[PDB]
Design a protein around this ligand. Sequence first.
Ligand SMILES: Cc1ccc(NC(=O)c2ccc(CN3CCN(C)CC3)cc2)cc1Nc1nccc(-c2cccnc2)n1
Length: 265
Amino acid sequence: AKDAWEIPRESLRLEVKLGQGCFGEVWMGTWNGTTRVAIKTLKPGTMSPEAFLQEAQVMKKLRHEKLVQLYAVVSEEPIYIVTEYMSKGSLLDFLKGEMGKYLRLPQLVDMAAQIASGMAYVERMNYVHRDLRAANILVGENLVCKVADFGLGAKFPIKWTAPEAALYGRFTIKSDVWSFGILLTELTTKGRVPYPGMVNREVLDQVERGYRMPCPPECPESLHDLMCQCWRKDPEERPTFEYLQAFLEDYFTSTEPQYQPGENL
Ligand SMILES: Cc1ccc(NC(=O)c2ccc(CN3CCN(C)CC3)cc2)cc1Nc1nccc(-c2cccnc2)n1
C-alpha cells in the first residue's frame, strides 16, 4: 500500500474554486507551496472511489507534452486528483475572450497542430477521447495547448459527436477525428457554437442527409476541405491524427504559401 503519486494532504492548498458538479469540484491551488496546480475533488457518497480513481489510473499511464499531466493524488476519501495548471484556461474561453480578437490563422493553425499532436499520442496508445472539443482544451503560456477531459444515457454533446457514435454508440479514434473537424470550426470562428441556429434535433437530421457546415468567413477553402475529410460519413475514410498533425504543422508552406492576413483570420 505505497504509491509514488501519493502526497500528504498538508501539501495541497485549494485557493480559488473554478467549478462544481454533482460529483465534486475543481480548484486552482498550490502544491508544496511552490507549484500552482489544478485540483479535482470527489464529493463523498455521490460516486464510488474506485470508479473515480479510474481516471487517475489512466492518467498515470499517459505522458505527453500536449496532454494535461497528472501531478499527484490523494486516493483515500476525500480524494483529490492534482495536475499541472494552465495559465490561460479553456481554449473556448480564450477564443471568445480578450485574446480572440488578436489571434490570426497562423496562430489558430499552430494550436490545431498541437491538439492534433496530443490526439496523435492518444491514437498511438490506442485510447479514445469521446469528448474532444474546445471546452476540453487547456491553454498555457506562449499559446501552448493541451488536450484534457473535464468529464463535462447522459449529457451528449451531439454537435461535436460523429453520427455513428451519437446514434449507435460506436466511439473510436475515428469519431474523435470527426470532433477535431468540429474543433477546427470553433478555432476559425473564435469559439462560436457549431451549426449556428440549429438545435440538436435538426443537426441530427441534417448531417444524416449529408449536410456539413460551410467554409467560415476568411477561412481558406483548403482548411475547410480538411474539415470535410474529418466529417466523412464513413469512419475509415477519415484521416488519422498523425496525418492531421503533419498537415497542420506544414500548412503555410505546402498548402497555403500565398497566405495573406485579413481582418479576422
Ligand atoms: C484536476 C484535474 C483532474 C483530472 C483531469 N483529467 C484529464 O484532463 C484527462 C485527460 C485525458 C484522459 C484520458 N481518457 C481516456 C478514456 N476516455 C474514454 C476518456 C479520456 C483522462 C483525463 C484534469 C484536471 N485538470 C483540470 N481540470 C479542470 C480545470 C483545469 C484548469 C482550469 C484553468 C487553468 N488550468 C487548469 N484543470
